[PDB]
Each structure stands twice: as structure tokens, then as C-alpha cells.
Amino acid sequence: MPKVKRSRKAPPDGWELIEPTLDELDQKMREAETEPHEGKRKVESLWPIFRIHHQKTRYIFDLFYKRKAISRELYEYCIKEGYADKNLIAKWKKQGYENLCCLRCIQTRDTNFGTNCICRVPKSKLEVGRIIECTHCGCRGCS
RNA sequence: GUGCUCGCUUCGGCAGCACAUAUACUAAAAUUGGAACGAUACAGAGAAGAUUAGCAUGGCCCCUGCGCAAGGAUGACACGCAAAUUCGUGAAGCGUU
Ligand SMILES: [Mg+2]
Ligand SMILES: [Mg+2]
Ligand SMILES: [Mg+2]
Ligand SMILES: [Zn+2]
Ligand SMILES: [Zn+2]
Ligand SMILES: [Zn+2]
């Protein structure tokens, strides 16, 4: 039934008020894992996973840095138990990197020419209104 | 998108600045051709009588094997009027100069 947790210590103080929605985000991830690929291209079928992973991480990020509604103990519990991404949070604290979808979309080893994805280009600098879905992510303009 | 703006200046909008700077064999396709060693009919082991161990040779024939081992019927093929340059003696008969 649970997330089966790997601490065996009781979860920290503010846990019971963020638990319905974390379990609701977790239910949404288990739906996306089982969606049968039919008219969903070979790269398009992994787009829900990066989106919900972004969503869970942004949820804990919004409660600890913006709303300030979680202590260090509860926050680091959620990172250890796999509800947030420590590395994606770490990029959102950088200056320009603040709606970043994926860690793939800034990885320069993953591209042909050693560069980011066009996901990361500012939308003013494309100048035309071309519509873009990043192949890694499905993103339409982080930046 | 975020933040700083002793920016207009409200907490609404806009202005400037800074940071952030180019994914993808681009398909969820449309097409396009070639193969298998299975049946189904005909077919039956090389060495000058017969029964036969084999080891090679050669390459527009390959198979099993990691193999520069070893096997595959000695793995198979090989069975061919197998003619390559280059001529002359002697006698006789007929016609001709
Ligand atoms: Mg042999
Ligand atoms: Mg024999
Ligand atoms: Mg042989
Ligand atoms: Zn991207
Ligand atoms: Zn992404
Ligand atoms: Zn993106």
C-alpha cells in the first residue's frame, strides 16, 4: 500500500498536512507508468514521467522556500524518501534556471553539438512564434 | 521566468537592466524490396569389381564453433569430343607452260 518507506523512523512533524497531496501526486505517477503507448510516440510516452517528477519537486520546493511551511527535518525527509529531487531543486536556486523541466534539458553531453536543448532558449530570441516541444521533456520553453 | 531597479509608481500595468541562448537517425508513419533450410513430387555417398578410414588442393559455395582447434558424406563443387604458336616426303594418273 504505501510508498514503502526506507527509514523505519517515524516521519517528522509537518508530515500529515502534506500527505494527501503527495500521495495524490504519487497516484498520478502510478497512472502514468501504466499508460499504454498507442498513439503516443516513442519519445512522447516518457513525457508524463518528467512532468510529474517536476510537479512533485516543485511542490516541496514551494512549501519550503516560498510559503515557508515545512521545517528542515520534514524537507530533508521528503528528499531522502524520494518525493523531491535534490538536484533539480539545486538548479532552481540558480539565477536563470528557475522553471527548468529536467536535468536532461541542460545536459550538454546528451546533445550532438555539445549544447543545451532549444527548450532552454528564451522565447523572445526565436522571434517567430514557432511552436516547440523538446524531445527529451515535452517542454515548451523553460526560460 | 526570476530578481534588482532610491523606474514611472501603484501594489494594477509598463519601462530599463542582469541571468538564462538553439533538441531531434526530426514518425504515432506511408512506402519499398528480400529471405527462410519445413512439407510436397523427382531424386541416393569419393578413390579404374564390391565394401569402404580419411588428410589435403582452389575459390564470385558456404554452415556449426570464441577459435590461427575441430567437425559438416574425406562438407559440397571438380568427371573434361582435355588439340596453343608452327610442317613436310615418295610414287602414280590427268590437265597446263
Ligand atoms: Mg575436415
Ligand atoms: Mg567416409
Ligand atoms: Mg573438403
Ligand atoms: Zn528541453
Ligand atoms: Zn525538460
Ligand atoms: Zn523545458
Render A53-105 in DSSP notation, one character per residue.
Answer: HHHHHHHHHIIIIIS--S-HHHHHHHHHTTSS-HHHHHHHTSSS-SS---SGG
CA A103 to chain centre: 9
**Contact (CB, 8 A) for A47 and A29:** no
Q: How many domains does chain A have?
A: 1
How far is C-alpha A140 from the chain's CA centre? 15
| CB atoms near residue A5 (< 10 Å) | 12
Distance A42 CA to B63 C1' (A): 38
Indicate which technique resolved this structure: cryo-EM
Task: List the one residue out of A92, A21, A80 whose CA is nearest residue A54.
Answer: A92
Judge whether residue A117 contacts strand B, using its CB and a 7 Å cut-off: yes
What's the reported resolution, in angstroms, to a tenth? 2.9
Ion ligand 4: protein residues whose beta carbon lies under 5 Å: A 105, 117, 119, 134, 137, 139
Q: Please give the distance, rounded to the nearest whole angstrom, from the Cα atom of residue A7 to the centre of ligand 3.
A: 70
**Cα angle for residues A10, A15, A19 (degrees, 5° grid):** 115
Q: Is residue A64 within 8 Å of residue A12, measured between CB atoms? A: no
Sign of the Cα torsion A63, A65, A67, A69 reads positive
Q: Give the bases of strand B that a protein CB approaches within 7 Å.
A: 1-2, 18-28
Task: Report residues 23-42 of A contacting strand B, contact meaning Cβ closer than 7 Å.
Answer: 38-42
Question: Which domain does A115 fall in, by range?
Answer: 1-143
| Angle (CA) A37 A42 A43, round 5° | 115
Beta carbons of A59 and A28 less than 8 angstroms apart? no
Residue A11 DSSP class: P
* Neighbouring residues of the ion ligand 6, judged by CB less than 5 Å: A 101, 105, 119, 139, 142
Residue A43 C-alpha cell reads as 519519445
Sequence-distant (≥ 6) Cβ neighbours of residue A71 within 8 angstroms: A12, A13, A14
DSSP A52: H
CA–CA separation, A44 and A46 (whole Å): 6
By C-alpha to C1' distance, B22 is nearest to A118
